[PDB]
Design a protein around this motif. Structure first.
Motif, PDB file in Angstrom:
ATOM      1  N   UNK A  97       0.773  -1.083   0.191  1.00  0.00           N
ATOM      2  CA  UNK A  97      -0.077  -0.050  -0.238  1.00  0.00           C
ATOM      3  C   UNK A  97       1.036   1.130   0.111  1.00  0.00           C
ATOM      4  N   UNK A  98       1.899   1.226   0.852  1.00  0.00           N
ATOM      5  CA  UNK A  98       2.775   2.410   0.900  1.00  0.00           C
ATOM      6  C   UNK A  98       3.655   2.678  -0.388  1.00  0.00           C
ATOM      7  N   UNK A  99       3.999   1.631  -1.062  1.00  0.00           N
ATOM      8  CA  UNK A  99       4.771   1.625  -2.226  1.00  0.00           C
ATOM      9  C   UNK A  99       3.847   2.156  -3.458  1.00  0.00           C
ATOM     10  N   UNK A 100       2.703   1.744  -3.600  1.00  0.00           N
ATOM     11  CA  UNK A 100       1.795   1.961  -4.782  1.00  0.00           C
ATOM     12  C   UNK A 100       1.608   3.490  -4.523  1.00  0.00           C
ATOM     13  N   UNK A 101       1.380   4.000  -3.253  1.00  0.00           N
ATOM     14  CA  UNK A 101       1.078   5.320  -3.113  1.00  0.00           C
ATOM     15  C   UNK A 101       2.292   6.508  -3.171  1.00  0.00           C
ATOM     16  N   UNK A 102       3.536   5.751  -2.923  1.00  0.00           N
ATOM     17  CA  UNK A 102       4.852   6.491  -3.324  1.00  0.00           C
ATOM     18  C   UNK A 102       5.120   6.563  -5.022  1.00  0.00           C
ATOM     19  N   UNK A 103       4.953   5.510  -5.640  1.00  0.00           N
ATOM     20  CA  UNK A 103       4.951   5.303  -7.017  1.00  0.00           C
ATOM     21  C   UNK A 103       3.935   6.338  -7.689  1.00  0.00           C
ATOM     22  N   UNK A 104       2.662   6.298  -6.884  1.00  0.00           N
ATOM     23  CA  UNK A 104       1.559   7.295  -7.439  1.00  0.00           C
ATOM     24  C   UNK A 104       1.847   8.659  -6.996  1.00  0.00           C
ATOM     25  N   UNK A 105       2.769   9.035  -6.669  1.00  0.00           N
ATOM     26  CA  UNK A 105       3.054  10.261  -6.146  1.00  0.00           C
ATOM     27  C   UNK A 105       4.424  11.048  -6.507  1.00  0.00           C
ATOM     28  N   UNK A 106       5.087  10.124  -7.133  1.00  0.00           N
ATOM     29  CA  UNK A 106       6.549  10.677  -7.580  1.00  0.00           C
ATOM     30  C   UNK A 106       6.446  12.037  -8.160  1.00  0.00           C
ATOM     31  N   UNK A 107       7.625  12.746  -7.910  1.00  0.00           N
ATOM     32  CA  UNK A 107       7.560  14.298  -8.326  1.00  0.00           C
ATOM     33  C   UNK A 107       8.393  14.299  -9.662  1.00  0.00           C
ATOM     34  N   UNK A 108       9.412  13.566  -9.919  1.00  0.00           N
ATOM     35  CA  UNK A 108      10.375  13.544 -10.855  1.00  0.00           C
ATOM     36  C   UNK A 108      11.035  12.317 -11.373  1.00  0.00           C
ATOM     37  N   UNK A 109      11.818  12.297 -12.473  1.00  0.00           N
ATOM     38  CA  UNK A 109      12.276  11.241 -12.869  1.00  0.00           C
ATOM     39  C   UNK A 109      13.525  10.468 -12.084  1.00  0.00           C
ATOM     40  N   UNK A 110      14.045  11.621 -11.274  1.00  0.00           N
ATOM     41  CA  UNK A 110      15.015  11.014 -10.206  1.00  0.00           C
ATOM     42  C   UNK A 110      14.599  10.293  -9.368  1.00  0.00           C
ATOM     43  N   UNK A 111      13.410  10.396  -8.928  1.00  0.00           N
ATOM     44  CA  UNK A 111      12.616   9.708  -8.092  1.00  0.00           C
ATOM     45  C   UNK A 111      12.247   8.076  -8.663  1.00  0.00           C
ATOM     46  N   UNK A 112      11.772   8.219  -9.844  1.00  0.00           N
ATOM     47  CA  UNK A 112      11.472   7.066 -10.751  1.00  0.00           C
ATOM     48  C   UNK A 112      12.467   6.284 -11.137  1.00  0.00           C
ATOM     49  N   UNK A 113      13.548   6.729 -11.406  1.00  0.00           N
ATOM     50  CA  UNK A 113      14.963   5.898 -11.686  1.00  0.00           C
ATOM     51  C   UNK A 113      15.485   5.462 -10.342  1.00  0.00           C
ATOM     52  N   UNK A 114      15.174   5.935  -9.214  1.00  0.00           N
ATOM     53  CA  UNK A 114      15.556   5.189  -7.846  1.00  0.00           C
ATOM     54  C   UNK A 114      14.536   4.269  -7.718  1.00  0.00           C
ATOM     55  N   UNK A 115      13.420   4.181  -7.929  1.00  0.00           N
ATOM     56  CA  UNK A 115      12.537   3.114  -7.537  1.00  0.00           C
ATOM     57  C   UNK A 115      13.035   1.910  -8.735  1.00  0.00           C
ATOM     58  N   UNK A 116      13.142   2.235 -10.054  1.00  0.00           N
ATOM     59  CA  UNK A 116      13.506   1.425 -11.073  1.00  0.00           C
ATOM     60  C   UNK A 116      14.879   0.682 -10.674  1.00  0.00           C
ATOM     61  N   UNK A 117      16.050   1.449 -10.047  1.00  0.00           N
ATOM     62  CA  UNK A 117      17.133   0.955  -9.791  1.00  0.00           C
ATOM     63  C   UNK A 117      16.825  -0.116  -8.840  1.00  0.00           C
TER      64      UNK A 117
END
Length: 364
Positions: A97-117
């Motif tokens: 639930x936490x992670x879905x919400x985190x992915x759902x509210x990312x602000x920028x590519x830096x954050x996305x690339x960190x999750x993907x990493x």
RNA sequence: UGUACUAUA
């Protein structure tokens, strides 16, 4: 009495794990005069415990709520702290639930690339990705990734799917087959190709599987795949087409395949040229196989649906020199079918087949 | 006469 205390003196780490304490904190984040204040005060105290709260029965609710107020810098530090633990978070009842919400509210590519990493092999194995795709809790995280992120981030999903025979592990699973369909609905054409190669490669373990049959049908709805998929499937399955038509699950693929041939050929008459050529050939060859095995098909609990689909003039009326051969072959199948009607008087669907030979007659 | 849809106060 808790409300009497200055925000500066609150034990936030203690309130986060407490149900009514957590609710109180969420309420403070929602009170505009104190929202920023309580957000910053609580953030500094709870940051060593981000992983702990993410996994917590009540803490996960606070983490979710925080995602609507955190600054980009706060959310970045949060993701930096927990990205190597995405597997463990995703399989967790509260973490998902936490992670879905985190992915759902990312602000920028830096954050996305960190999750993907974190989802890359540096931290999460291929086998773990397969596990997430099929996991009761984790498959929702994978889905979130699929709908939130650009397909250019899909590497770890694609890599896990095409590895060895994971296509089987995924397509024959109750959750994995759903996930796979959602992926295919949004990923790039070249990503579809790679997965389709693996699906064709393991066709026999898929085509009559309770869930795998939906995957094969899903592929037959992607028009960009027509130029190879029709010929490719037919060439793997022709020799056992009658058998496949007589099985609970694969019978639906055969029908879907036959309808697709009809829609493609008639679309020309009323539209890729190369497809049409071989689609006409496959259709004629199919009628021949069904003509040869008519006695088994007309009598089979599943085979009769495939037969009826092939016999229904709703599907081929524009077709009434391919049209010439088709008419002779489909006409002959009709004749042979009616000769057999008295030999199936018992069956409850005889009238359905009688209706189709009749509808053929009215149209011709 | 015939097949799948999942998760927290």
């Amino acid at each position: 009495e808790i409300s009497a205390l200055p925000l500066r003196d609150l034990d936030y780490i203690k309130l986060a794990t407490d149900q009514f304490g957590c609710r109180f904190l969420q309420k403070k984040l929602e009170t505009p005069s104190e929202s920023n204040m309580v957000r910053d005060l609580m953030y500094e105290q709870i940051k060593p415990f981000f992983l702990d709260l993410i996994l917590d029965p009540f803490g996960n609710y606070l983490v979710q709520k925080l995602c609507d107020y955190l600054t980009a810098e706060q959310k970045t530090l949060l993701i930096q702290t927990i990205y190597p633990n995405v597997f463990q978070i995703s399989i967790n009842q509260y973490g998902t639930r936490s992670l879905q919400k985190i992915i759902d509210t990312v602000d920028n590519e830096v954050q996305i690339d960190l999750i993907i990493k974190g989802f890359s092999q540096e931290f999460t194995s291929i086998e773990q990705v397969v596990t997430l795709i099929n996991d009761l809790n984790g498959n929702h995280v994978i889905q979130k990734c699929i709908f939130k992120f650009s397909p250019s981030k899909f590497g770890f999903i694609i890599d896990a799917i095409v590895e060895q025979n994971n296509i089987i592990t995924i397509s024959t699973h109750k959750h994995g087959c759903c996930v796979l369909q959602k992926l295919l609905s949004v990923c790039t054409l070249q990503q579809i190709f790679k997965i389709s190669v693996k699906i064709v490669q393991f066709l026999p373990g898929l085509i009559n599987d309770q869930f795998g049959n939906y995957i094969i049908q899903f592929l037959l709805d992607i028009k960009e795949l027509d130029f190879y998929l029709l010929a490719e499937l037919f060439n793997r399955l022709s020799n056992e087409l009658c058998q496949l038509s007589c099985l609970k699950f694969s019978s639906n693929v055969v029908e879907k395949f036959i309808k697709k041939l009809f829609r493609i050929i008639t679309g020309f008459i009323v539209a890729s040229d190369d497809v049409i050529n071989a689609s006409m050939n496959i259709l004629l060859t199919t009628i021949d196989i069904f003509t040869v095995n008519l006695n088994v098909l007309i009598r089979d609990n599943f085979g009769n649906y495939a037969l009826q689909t092939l016999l229904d003039v709703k599907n081929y009326s524009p077709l009434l020199n391919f049209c010439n051969d088709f008419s002779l072959k489909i006409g002959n199948l009709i004749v042979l079918t009616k000769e057999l009607l008295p030999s199936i008087k018992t069956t409850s669907y005889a009238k359905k087949i009688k209706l189709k030979v009749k509808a053929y007659a009215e149209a011709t």
